[PDB]
């Protein structure tokens, strides 16, 4: 239950995201202030091809870590922010199951808005491998963090609901991550519908005028994948777009 | 349904009980007993060597002087006799080891049969619970009518 | 032997003691070990000749170390026995290598040696015997006698002698002091031999038997299911927990990180390991058996709290 | 043979003696903290620190003194030892597992005599009190053997009776006495038995009892008028003992 | 070093102390990291077993031999010893097809598996 | 078989990626080890890992077992029975085997054990033999005796290679073992020896004879242990004459020299008129014999006697010193032939081999500092 | 102990006068032989004891099974009586109808 | 453990007031005897009871 | 039907199991024991 | 026995091995050929155990199984025990038919 | 059981002093095809 709320951490000064959620107490330079960072990962496409995560190293500074699940004989690798800025460039084909990384700097604006890190493995021929994930970065005064966490924990215990769905309800109500009375109204409906129809909690979330989740969690695929990426149509992955 | 569930539990108890016995092949104490039977039989060669040494020693005279001798002329035959008698007792010891072991084998075989009997009973009972559930549904439909 | 001081001893904590000018004028090794950060109180019996090979002393004892690996004129104690049998150290001795040397001139004996020629039999008399007896009593459910017997090896409440509480839990000298009963158990497949090399394992075995007994008593009472035998069971389970202490807790994230097999299998890692990718080595596993005891107790406690039978069945009609 | 050892009592005292034995000399003076526990708001566990303050001098000149401490955690940390009234703190950065110490920035031991807060900043938080100042020096004049025999009392002292004094040692000392003559006459023999009680005891220079050990020597007194018991066999077939 | 013994109290089993520290300095904190059975990261996990088997098995045949382990199955070495690889159950057959299908794609110089199936669909021999 | 993966197996059957990799390798390994797939690396195959393939390494569960044993032997230790327990422990266990076990039964069983314990604890060592040339290598056998009239002899040994840093490891010692031979050593005159890698006991016995006048006959008894641990019967040699040659005082026993000898593949036995000074044996005439594996014997001639004496006298007991014999040897002990190769291998392209050659004879000279070895291979 | 004591005693000569000696040269071997025979018989007695003990244990295990069978029977019968009681009530309602 | 009464028990479980007190004390005694609860009194423990 | 089928299987197991035991006659171990008893009796003339 | 383990096997083995040696080392003492010529018939041999109170054994070889210079494996019979109290002076003994 | 069969035969051969030997049959006469009979037709005997 603890992991469901805060991911994984160890006394070795090591932190690791879980349920696509990364949480950490970054201390400001020469400043005891703790900026608690929370980074949420979602996939936009081809999650099965690669593991991608981004760490809040410092002001606008992030460590981008990734590992490929397969292999292409790429001439080079190119990683872009929102398909325009090349964050990383390296030559040669990355190897399967080898972790690669780079230090990048994101603009405050890039950080505060949802953004996408796309990774393309470029072949010597007219093609490339591609996968991508969406990230959002939040910062809190440690007190602000602890207080929101307090609410989340108590609400989860009171409702027996996962932090995944609970965030979804909150995001459905407001762009910002805040528990309020409209959230509680939807939480009621969420549970009510589960009881009324004998349905999965995620289904109940959708009925609360919520989007299909593209967020994987635990050891489970996202809702999106569960609907559209079950054994693929001749291997073609279903993804959103224009 | 309640009656059948209690039957199921009964069969389940029997199944697990025979299971346990089947799995616990030989009680450690039972192994010690067999070990001892073997160990006693194992003395045959030690025994023979001693009796033989004995007989030879007694062929040596022990009275000396202006009269003497006293060697036991029949010593070899007597020692020979004892070894054969011992051997007969050994054969029983060995046969007893065997008989005990085979007895246990047969016992375990019976447990396996009874284990399987209980298993069959459980399966029939589950099948009976299933048929009952169907009957119950029919009764519900009868009520509906 | 004084505590380790790299600056005077060398980078190695290695040292040896030798006896010389007894039987021959050659030296022989009589002690070996590492220097620690405290004093090493090494008591040895020093043999003496009927005919001395030296007028100033009947025996020489010396110590060597990395920065002073050798012998030398007057290095170490030089002992002489007078006609009354009193052994003193000749003032010519250079005692610099030692913190102190003290001859026990009124001691003509020593405590029995559990690591010596008859060690085998002492191990059985003072350990395997009561462990065996207790295990048999445990199997037969003779719990009261079984407890008496485990206590001859170890008592979590200590011992009382002539009305006085003692300062120890282990009643077995070689477990109380961690005494080795082996030299190399890796030459075979044998858990006894392993424990013999590393006596801490016997300490563990003893602990486990104690838990087994407490659990068995608990379970017995629980199977009876009378209100009061249930209360009794609860008590015995608490005892097992007291002995187990605080339940273990493990880290949420390892330093190990789903490494590629070629890498994991790279002999370089293995060579680096034995010489000492070491970050991606496989981690030590907890003793899952001990884990299982914690789990066992938790289920029993739960069931008692929920008014369930030992099998977790409701002690009530629905 | 009188045997003295600074073998601390299991748990707290043992841990404190281990620090003492490793970082000081017999003769050193220390502040030993006798009252230990875990802080109600700062601790997430039941683990604790076992501090001892070592004073400079007393055979161990120190660079302003040291705080010795034992800790249970296996993780490296910054062990902070904060003194509220002094507004001072020592910080053992990247502290060793088990036994370590912090350099005292100022040899003002007076500051130590108060409640001290210790933490590893990972949730181990120890409440430290009971600052007892102890001189570990042991004069041989305080090492004694006391004999009670009948109505008589005799004492013996190591600096008179022990020809060679042992080197100072926390780890172990043995004071081997020459023959101590006891005036056995006067023993009150009851049922032809009396005994001599021999007490082995000693004090540290502060007048701190080091401990004691008691032995006794039973004596059987032969009775000169005690005629052998006689077996008799009477002509009437009666056998008895006289 | 094992906390299970350390918490026992009444056994007086002592930690290696300086040797724990030295070990951890050489092994990146490893002795402070104990694991539950069931994690892939464990010394006794089947992955540990696998690692040993691979390390030794790969040296049974010459690197240029048809029977060289890696030649016949290049994926064994490229596969990671992941917790999910250990925990996820999946059709053995789908794994067999995955292997053969990738091999064919490579030999045939094709872009993907749909191209492979189209190619195979008209194969005559 | 080639790809180490089943392409015929039903779709319904599932596995894990780790399990598959394991299974695949196990098949790979079996085939190489079984010589299914040729041109395997024999160097690698000979590695211990593969030696153990059939036990512990082939199957993960047994692998884990032996591996775990190292860290958690206690999960495998069962006090009911331990490897290498002695017969006294066996008796103890058996004595408590009944289910109706209680304190009275337990205390009596304990005392039975303890009685046997004492019998062992108090064994007196009578004599010993080191089966080597030098005392620094090999092992020493000791024979002792139970304290009872018409008592029993026991033996055990110690391994000198375990005498690390001046002390024997606990592992260096073996338990005392019973001797079932009707031994009646005259005034303790007995020696344990090794001959042909077998333990033998030799002792002298005295028979009281009425001649009136009283006199005595002396006989040498030889016995050896069998493969099942039981012993053979004593073999008697008529040594009465050899003993009559030693001008011993009426209550003295001859000293007994006895050790095996690799040269001449024999057992060397000699008797002597024990002296106070070891060096006095340098001029003693040893009364001896040779004993063969077939229990044949030969008288030892004066020349042979003097030779063995000169090279062994330093081991003889003196009036007040009880010494341990070693294997008889001269400057160098060298084998007479070689039949067992240490290594070998294939020729180019494996079309030939140099193999089963030998060293049918080894002769040598050994002058001071000049060892000349003659090999006729 | 008695057999060994015997052997010691009989190694003592028993003939004195002009002709003497009379000891039994094989006395040790005989004692040894008698002990081995006794030992074999002891092992069989101990083994019989053990078998007997374990035999009783198994008997009890069988009793527990039979006990539990009876227990199950009681539970089934009680459940059947309840089933019948319901049937009876239905019959009562049928009479009422 | 401190209060010698289990606060995690279902309401279904019932006993009497004397019986509960016994249990509380017995748990206390065991903890004192095994020094679960440190700085226990060696006198008293040493008594025959 | 399913219930009857499970019953059939139960009976089948018993049939085959008892079949096997019957067909086995005397276990080889049992044969050795008989041999030993006979062998001991056979010593009568040797002993005499 | 149904319960076997490694120690059991080794002990059984050493028992066999012991008996093997006992036979392997029998000395040949004397023999008799029951025919007129030694090219027909068979030779009966007697041997002796290397033990005190040594036991006598006999076996024979079939000469008709001597083919092209060597006896067949079939030419030989096994050693058989003799149960008689035999103790000749200077081993003066012959088998005869 | 495996170990006891291996003493007669091993498909993997044998290792002595760390070195793999040149044979699979560990029974010299089998490796050599040595006859233990002269005429097995004397009786119906699978062993002969």
DSSP string, C53-83: S-SS-SEEEEEEETTB-S--TTBB-EEEE-T
Which residues are bridge partners to D33 per DSSP?
D131
**F295 to chain J: which residues are within 8 Å by CB?**
50
| Closest residue in K to J13 (Cα–Cα) | K4
| Cα dist from G11 to F86, F181, F207, whole Å | 33, 16, 10
User: Are F119 and F146 in contact, with CB atoms under 8 Å apart?
Assistant: yes
Touching pair G, A by Cβ (3+ pairs < 8 Å):
no
Nearest to F233 among J14, J25, J52 (CB): J52
- Name the one residue in this structure whose structure tokens are 């013999």: C196
**3-state SS, residue E11:** coil
**K18 to chain F: which residues are within 8 Å by CB?**
46
Whole-angstrom distance, CA of residue D69 vs CA of residue D23: 10
Burial of H4 (0-12, 13-18, 19+ CB in 10 A): middle
Kindly calculate the radius of gyration of chain E based on its CA atoms and give it in whole angstroms: 23
Interface test with J, best of K38, K47, K48 (most J CBs within 10 A): K38
**C227 to chain H: which residues are within 8 Å by CB?**
14-15
| Closest residue in A to C262 (Cα–Cα) | A97
Give the gap in angstroms from C-alpha K45 to the nearest C-alpha of chain F. Answer: 33
Which run of H or of E encompasses G21? strand G20-21
| Cα dist from G70 to B3, B7, B17, C87, C311, whole Å | 14, 11, 15, 84, 20
- Name the one residue in this structure whose structure tokens are 């012993």: F231
**3-state SS, residue A215:** coil
Whole-angstrom distance, CA of residue F147 vs CA of residue F125: 11
Supply H36's token pair.
Answer: 């679960």
Output the CA torsion sign for A37, A42, A46, A48.
positive
Sheet holding F153-159, edge to edge: F124-130, F139-145, F153-159, F177-178
Whole-angstrom distance, CA of residue F171 vs CA of residue C184: 9
Supply C217's token pair.
Answer: 């008593």
Interface test with D, best of C36, C39, C163 (most D CBs within 10 A): C39
Whole-angstrom distance, CA of residue D97 vs CA of residue H30: 33
Residues 6+ apart with CB under 8 A from F195: F260, F266, F267, F291, F293
- Say yes or no for a CB contact (<8 Å) between C244 and E7: yes
**3-state SS, residue C97:** coil
| Cα dist from C29 to C46, C110, C279, whole Å | 12, 20, 41
| Closest residue in C to F22 (Cα–Cα) | C261
What approach was used to elucidate this structure? cryo-EM
- Say yes or no for a CB contact (<8 Å) between F73 and C183: no
Nearest to F150 among G7, G13, G19 (CB): G7
User: Are B36 and G46 in contact, with CB atoms under 8 Å apart?
Assistant: yes
| Closest residue in D to A9 (Cα–Cα) | D122
**D75 to chain A: which residues are within 8 Å by CB?**
11-12
Interface test with C, best of F55, F74, F121 (most C CBs within 10 A): F74
Give the gap in angstroms from C-alpha A13 to the nearest C-alpha of chain D. Answer: 10
Whole-angstrom distance, CA of residue H1 vs CA of residue J94: 93
User: Are G19 and B64 in contact, with CB atoms under 8 Å apart?
Assistant: yes
Q: How many whole angstroms from its chain centre is CA B119?
A: 26
Nearest to F210 among B29, B49, B65 (CB): B65
Which residues are bridge partners to C62 per DSSP?
C18
Distance between start and end Cα atoms, chain F: 47
Touching pair G, D by Cβ (3+ pairs < 8 Å):
no
DSSP for D110-143, please give it: GGGSS-EEEE-SSS-EEEEEEEEEEE----GGGE
Whole-angstrom distance, CA of residue D46 vs CA of residue H1: 15
**3-state SS, residue A192:** helix
- Say yes or no for a CB contact (<8 Å) between B3 and G76: yes
Whole-angstrom distance, CA of residue D115 vs CA of residue D127: 7
Residues 6+ apart with CB under 8 A from C264: C277, C280, E47, E51, E81
Give the gap in angstroms from C-alpha J4 to the nearest C-alpha of chain I. Answer: 13
Residues 6+ apart with CB under 8 A from H26: C235
**F63 to chain E: which residues are within 8 Å by CB?**
49
Whole-angstrom distance, CA of residue C104 vs CA of residue F22: 64
Query: What is the DSSP pairing of strand D66-70 with strand D99-103?
Result: antiparallel
User: Are D80 and D121 in contact, with CB atoms under 8 Å apart?
Assistant: yes
- Say yes or no for a CB contact (<8 Å) between I46 and J83: yes
User: Are F10 and F31 in contact, with CB atoms under 8 Å apart?
Assistant: no
Whole-angstrom distance, CA of residue A210 vs CA of residue A225: 16
Q: Is F40 an interface residue toward K (CB < 8 Å)? A: no
Give the gap in angstroms from C-alpha C254 to the nearest C-alpha of chain E. Answer: 7
Burial of D168 (0-12, 13-18, 19+ CB in 10 A): middle
- Name the one residue in this structure whose structure tokens are 């097992």: C240
User: Are B72 and G27 in contact, with CB atoms under 8 Å apart?
Assistant: no
Whole-angstrom distance, CA of residue A79 vs CA of residue D50: 53
- Name the one residue in this structure whose structure tokens are 């010692």: F173
- Say yes or no for a CB contact (<8 Å) between F231 and B46: yes
- Say yes or no for a CB contact (<8 Å) between C41 and D172: yes
- Say yes or no for a CB contact (<8 Å) between J2 and B49: no
Q: What is the resolution in angstroms?
A: 4.0
Supply F98's token pair.
Answer: 């009944």
Cβ–Cβ contacts within 10 Å for residue C83, how many?
5
Give the gap in angstroms from C-alpha C212 to the nearest C-alpha of chain D. Answer: 26
Give the gap in angstroms from C-alpha C89 to the nearest C-alpha of chain D. Answer: 12
User: Are B44 and B90 in contact, with CB atoms under 8 Å apart?
Assistant: yes
- Say yes or no for a CB contact (<8 Å) between I43 and B95: no
| Closest residue in D to A12 (Cα–Cα) | D75
Output the CA torsion sign for F157, F162, F163, F168.
negative
- Say yes or no for a CB contact (<8 Å) between E57 and F60: no
Whole-angstrom distance, CA of residue F319 vs CA of residue F331: 28
| Closest residue in J to F234 (Cα–Cα) | J52
Whole-angstrom distance, CA of residue C39 vs CA of residue C2: 5
Supply F211's token pair.
Answer: 């001649």
Beta strands in chain D (DSSP E): 2-4, 29-38, 50-54, 66-70, 78-83, 88-93, 99-103, 116-119, 125-135, 143-149, 152-157, 173-175, 193-204, 208-220, 231-233, 239-241
Residues 6+ apart with CB under 8 A from C195: C181, C201, C202, C205, F73, F74, F77
Whole-angstrom distance, CA of residue I3 vs CA of residue I9: 10
Nearest to J53 among B25, B31, B56 (CB): B56
Kindly give the residue spans of alpha helices, DSSP state H, lying in chain B. 2-23, 28-41, 44-57, 75-144
**Planar angle of CA J85, J86, J88, nearest 5 degrees:** 150
Distance between start and end Cα atoms, chain D: 46
Nearest to B85 among I21, I32, I47 (CB): I47
Question: Using CB atoms, which chains have 3+ pairs under 8 A with F?
Answer: B, C, E, G, J, K
Which 8-state DSSP code applies to residue C125?
Answer: I
Nearest to C252 among A9, A95, A97 (CB): A9
Interface test with F, best of G11, G30, G34, G60 (most F CBs within 10 A): G11
**Planar angle of CA C196, C202, C203, nearest 5 degrees:** 140
Give the gap in angstroms from C-alpha G84 to the nearest C-alpha of chain B. Answer: 11
**D169 to chain C: which residues are within 8 Å by CB?**
39
Sheet holding F198-210, edge to edge: F190-195, F198-210, F214-224, F235-238
| Cα dist from F217 to A175, F207, J64, whole Å | 117, 5, 53
Whole-angstrom distance, CA of residue F182 vs CA of residue G32: 8
**3-state SS, residue A80:** strand
| Closest residue in E to D95 (Cα–Cα) | E21
Whole-angstrom distance, CA of residue F366 vs CA of residue F262: 17
Whole-angstrom distance, CA of residue A38 vs CA of residue F314: 87
């Amino acid at each position: 239950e603890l992991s469901q709320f805060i991911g994984k951490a160890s006394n070795f000064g090591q932190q690791e995201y879980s349920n696509n959620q990364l949480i950490t107490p970054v201390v400001n330079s020469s400043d005891g202030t703790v900026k608690v960072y929370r980074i949420t990962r979602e996939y936009t496409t081809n999650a099965y091809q690669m593991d991608v995560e981004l760490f809040p190293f410092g002001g606008e500074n992030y460590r981008l870590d990734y590992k490929f699940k397969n292999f292409y004989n790429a001439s080079y690798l190119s990683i872009k922010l929102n398909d325009k800025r090349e964050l990383v460039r390296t030559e040669g084909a990355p190897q399967v199951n080898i972790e690669y990384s780079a230090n990048i700097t994101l603009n405050t604006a890039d950080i505060s808005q949802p953004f996408e890190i796309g990774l393309t493995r470029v072949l010597p021929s007219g093609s490339w491998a591609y996968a991508a994930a969406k990230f959002t970065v939040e910062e809190y005064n440690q007190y602000s963090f602890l207080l929101k966490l307090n609410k989340a924990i108590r609400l989860s215990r009171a409702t027996e609901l996962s932090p995944t769905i609970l965030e979804g309800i909150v995001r459905s109500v407001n762009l910002q991550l805040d528990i309020n009375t409209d959230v509680l109204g939807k939480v009621f409906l969420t549970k009510y519908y589960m009881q009324r129809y004998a349905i999965h909690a995620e289904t109940a979330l959708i009925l609360c005028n919520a989007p299909i989740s593209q967020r994987s969690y635990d050891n489970q695929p996202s809702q999106f994948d569960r609907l559209f990426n079950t054994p693929l149509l001749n291997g073609q992955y279903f993804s959103t777009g224009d | 349904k309640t009656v059948l569930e209690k039957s199921k539990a009964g069969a389940q108890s029997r199944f697990d009980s025979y299971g346990k016995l089947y799995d616990e092949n030989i009680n450690a104490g039972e192994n010690q007993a067999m070990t001892l039977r073997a160990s006693a039989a194992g003395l045959t060669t030690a025994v023979q060597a001693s009796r033989l040494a004995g007989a030879a020693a007694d062929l040596v005279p022990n009275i000396f002087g202006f009269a003497g001798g006293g060697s036991r002329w029949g010593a070899i035959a007597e020692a020979t006799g004892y070894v054969m008698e011992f051997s007969a007792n050994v054969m029983n010891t060995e046969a007893d080891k065997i008989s005990q072991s085979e007895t246990y084998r047969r016992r375990r075989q019976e447990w396996e049969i009874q284990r399987n009997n209980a298993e069959a009973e459980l399966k029939q009972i589950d099948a009976q619970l299933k048929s009952l559930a169907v009957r119950r549904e029919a009764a519900v439909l009868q009520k509906t009518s | 032997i004084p505590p380790y001081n790299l600056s005077t001893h060398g980078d190695e904590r290695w040292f040896k003691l030798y006896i010389k000018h007894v039987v021959d004028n050659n030296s022989h090794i009589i002690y070996s070990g590492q220097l620690t950060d405290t004093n090493i109180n090494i008591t040895l019996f020093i043999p003496l000749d009927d005919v001395p090979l030296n007028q100033d002393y009947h025996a020489k004892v010396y110590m060597t170390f990395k920065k002073s690996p050798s012998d030398g004129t007057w290095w170490g104690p030089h002992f002489v026995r007078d006609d009354k049998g009193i052994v003193t150290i000749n003032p010519k001795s250079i005692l610099t290598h030692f913190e102190s040397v003290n001859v026990l001139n009124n001691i003509s004996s020593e405590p029995m040696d559990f690591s010596g020629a008859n060690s085998l039999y002492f191990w059985e008399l003072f350990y395997y015997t009561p462990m065996l007896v207790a295990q048999r009593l445990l199997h037969e459910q003779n719990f009261d006698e079984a407890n008496r017997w485990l206590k001859y090896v170890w008592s979590p409440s200590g011992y009382i002698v002539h009305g006085q509480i003692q300062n120890y839990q282990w009643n077995v000298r070689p477990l109380l002091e961690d005494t080795s009963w082996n030299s190399d158990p890796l030459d075979s497949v044998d858990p006894d031999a392993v424990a013999q090399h590393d006596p801490m394992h016997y300490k563990v075995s003893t602990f486990m038997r104690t838990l087994d007994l407490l659990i068995a008593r608990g379970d017995h009472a629980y199977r009876q299911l009378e209100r009061d035998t249930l209360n009794e069971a609860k008590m015995w389970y608490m005892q097992a927990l007291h002995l187990l202490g605080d339940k273990p807790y493990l880290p949420l994230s390892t330093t190990w990180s789903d490494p590629r097999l070629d890498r994991a299998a790279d002999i370089t890692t293995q060579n680096a390991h034995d010489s000492a990718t070491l970050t991606d080595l496989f981690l030590p596993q907890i003793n899952e058996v001990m884990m299982n005891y914690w789990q066992t107790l938790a289920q029993r406690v739960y069931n008692l709290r929920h008014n369930l039978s030992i099998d977790g069945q409701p002690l009530y009609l629905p | 043979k009188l045997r003295i050892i600074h073998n601390g009592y299991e748990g707290q005292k043992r841990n404190q003696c281990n620090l003492m034995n490793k970082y000081g000399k017999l003769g050193d003076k220390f502040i030993v903290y006798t009252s230990l526990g875990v802080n109600p708001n700062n601790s997430s566990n039941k683990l604790m620190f076992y501090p001892v303050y070592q004073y400079s001098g007393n055979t161990s000149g120190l660079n302003q003194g040291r705080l010795l401490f034992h800790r249970d955690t296996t993780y490296p940390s910054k062990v902070e030892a904060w003194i509220p009234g002094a507004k001072r703190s020592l910080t053992n950065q990247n502290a060793a597992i088990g036994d370590d110490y912090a350099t005292d920035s100022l040899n003002k031991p007076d500051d130590l005599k108060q409640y001290i807060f210790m933490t590893d900043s990972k949730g181990t938080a120890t409440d430290v009190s009971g600052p007892v100042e102890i001189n570990t020096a042991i004069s041989p004049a305080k090492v004694q053997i006391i004999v009670k025999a009948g109505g008589k009392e005799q004492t013996f002292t190591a600096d008179k009776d022990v020809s060679i004094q042992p080197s100072p040692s926390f780890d172990e000392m043995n004071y081997q006495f020459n023959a101590l003559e006891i005036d056995g006459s006067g023993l009150n023999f009851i049922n032809n038995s009396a005994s001599i009680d021999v007490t082995f005891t000693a004090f540290a220079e502060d007048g701190r009892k080091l401990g004691y050990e008691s032995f006794s020597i039973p004596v059987t007194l032969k009775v000169s008028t005690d005629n052998a018991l006689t077996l008799h066999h009477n002509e009437n077939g009666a056998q008895y003992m006289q | 070093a094992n906390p299970q013994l350390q918490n026992a109290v009444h056994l007086a089993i002592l930690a290696p102390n300086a040797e724990l520290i030295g070990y951890n300095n050489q092994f990146s904190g490893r002795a402070s990291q104990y694991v539950a059975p069931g994690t892939v990261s464990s010394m006794f996990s089947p992955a540990a077993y696998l690692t040993e088997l691979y390390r030794e098995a790969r040296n049974l045949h010459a690197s240029d031999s048809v029977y060289y382990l890696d030649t016949r199955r290049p994926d064994l070495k490229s596969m990671a010893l992941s917790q999910q690889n250990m925990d996820i159950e999946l059709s053995t057959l789908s794994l067999s097809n995955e292997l053969l299908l990738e091999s064919i794609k490579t030999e045939s110089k094709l872009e993907n598996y749909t191209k492979v199936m189209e190619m195979l669909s008209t194969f005559r021999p | 078989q080639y790809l180490l993966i089943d392409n015929q197996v039903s779709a319904a059957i599932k596995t894990t990626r780790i399990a598959e990799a394991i299974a695949s390798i196990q098949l790979y390994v079996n085939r190489a080890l079984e010589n299914v797939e040729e041109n395997a690396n024999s160097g690698v195959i000979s590695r211990q890992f593969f030696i153990d393939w059939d036990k512990y390494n082939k199957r993960y569960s047994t692998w884990a077992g032996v591996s775990q044993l190292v860290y958690y032997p206690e999960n495998y230790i069962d006090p009911t029975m331990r490897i290498g327990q002695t017969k006294m422990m066996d008796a103890l266990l058996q004595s408590v085997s009944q289910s109706q076990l209680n304190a009275d039964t337990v205390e009596d069983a304990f005392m039975s054990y303890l009685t046997s314990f004492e019998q062992v604890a108090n064994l007196k060592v009578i004599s010993a033999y080191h089966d080597n040339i030098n005392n620094d290598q090999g092992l020493t056998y000791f024979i002792g005796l139970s304290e009872t009239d018409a008592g029993e002899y026991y033996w055990r040994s110690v391994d000198h290679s375990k005498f690390n840093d001046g002390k024997f490891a606990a592992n260096a010692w073996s338990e005392w073992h019973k001797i079932d031979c009707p031994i009646n050593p005259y005034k303790s005159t007995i020696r344990p020896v090794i001959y042909k890698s077998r333990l033998y006991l030799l002792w002298l016995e005295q028979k009281e004879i009425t001649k009136t006048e009283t006199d005595y006959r002396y006989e040498l008894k030889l016995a050896h242990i069998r493969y099942d641990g039981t012993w053979n019967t004593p073999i008697t040699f008529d040594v009465n004459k050899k003993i009559s040659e030693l001008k011993l005082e009426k209550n003295r026993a001859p000293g007994l020299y006895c050790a095996g000898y690799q040269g001449e593949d024999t057992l060397l036995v000699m008797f002597y008129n024990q002296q106070d000074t070891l060096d006095s044996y340098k001029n003693a005439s040893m009364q001896g014999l040779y004993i063969f594996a077939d229990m044949a014997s030969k008288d030892m001639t004066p020349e042979q006697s003097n030779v063995y004496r000169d090279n062994s006298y330093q081991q003889f007991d003196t009036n007040n010193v009880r010494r341990v014999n070693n294997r008889y040897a001269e400057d160098y002990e060298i084998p007479s032939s070689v039949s067992s190769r240490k290594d070998y291998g294939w020729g180019d392209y494996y079309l030939s081999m140099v193999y089963n050659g030998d060293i049918p004879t080894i002769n040598y000279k050994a002058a001071s500092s000049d060892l000349k070895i003659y090999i006729s291979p």
